[PDB]
Write a protein that binds this ligand. Structure first.
Ligand SMILES: CO[C@H]1O[C@H](CO)[C@@H](O)[C@H](O)[C@H]1O
Ligand SMILES: [Ca+2]
Ligand SMILES: [Ca+2]
Ligand SMILES: [Ca+2]
Ligand SMILES: [Ca+2]
Ligand SMILES: [Ca+2]
Ligand SMILES: [Ca+2]
Ligand SMILES: [Ca+2]
Ligand SMILES: [Ca+2]
Length: 182
């Protein structure tokens, strides 16, 4: 049975190879078991320095979510996270605005809705709008990585045409698509 919690299922992967793009990180995820798992209940991570994959930097980056880590990974040069689960959204129009170092991809109901397919120092992109056709728990997944140096990841979402944005957190996240009461 899968744990029901108000968050996404988190997996962390580290590597001593260079992560240059989304393909490289997804290949890392498919290559092995997660180096750690966690509950992603407050998806606003970092900012920090001196490589996410070194020392306790992952714990610092994950902050409020670090207390759910399954283990303390050893050192790597490069690393990233894969989050998957569900997000409660009412039918309507939305767009992401993401602050990140390095890149990332977010999908909703299997369709990319926010993509940065390269390394970058901290940058904020306002992404194109997408529609939700039916109110309820939408499938969501995210990948983010750090090739080294600084690291930050804060996807925010707007329901009102970019006037206000919110962090994805325990108010609307579900690990399985059932209603969490945690
Ligand atoms: C040179 O380092 C800078 O740029 C790279 C991307 O090239 C980022 O990954 C890193 O965090 C940032 O500090
Ligand atoms: Ca895997
Ligand atoms: Ca460590
Ligand atoms: Ca924090
Ligand atoms: Ca905590
Ligand atoms: Ca730069
Ligand atoms: Ca690297
Ligand atoms: Ca970096
Ligand atoms: Ca505003």
């Amino acid at each position: 049975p899968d744990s029901l919690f108000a968050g996404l299922v988190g997996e962390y992967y580290g590597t001593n190879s260079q992560l240059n793009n989304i393909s490289d990180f997804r290949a890392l995820v498919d290559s092995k078991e997660a180096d750690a798992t966690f509950e992603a209940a407050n998806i606003s991570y970092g900012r920090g320095s001196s490589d996410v994959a070194k020392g306790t930097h992952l714990q610092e980056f994950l902050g409020s979510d670090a207390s759910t880590l399954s283990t303390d990974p050893g050192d790597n040069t490069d690393g990233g996270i894969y989050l998957q689960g569900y997000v409660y959204l009412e039918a309507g129009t939305y767009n992401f605005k993401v602050t990140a170092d390095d890149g990332y991809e977010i999908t909703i109901n299997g369709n990319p809705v926010a993509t940065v397919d390269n390394n970058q120092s901290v940058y904020t992109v306002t992404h194109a709008s997408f529609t939700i056709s039916e109110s309820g728990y939408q499938a969501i997944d995210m990948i983010w990585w750090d090739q080294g140096g600084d690291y930050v990841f804060q996807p925010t979402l707007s329901a009102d045409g970019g006037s206000t944005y919110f962090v994805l957190d325990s108010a609307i996240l579900s690990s399985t698509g059932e209603t969490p009461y945690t």
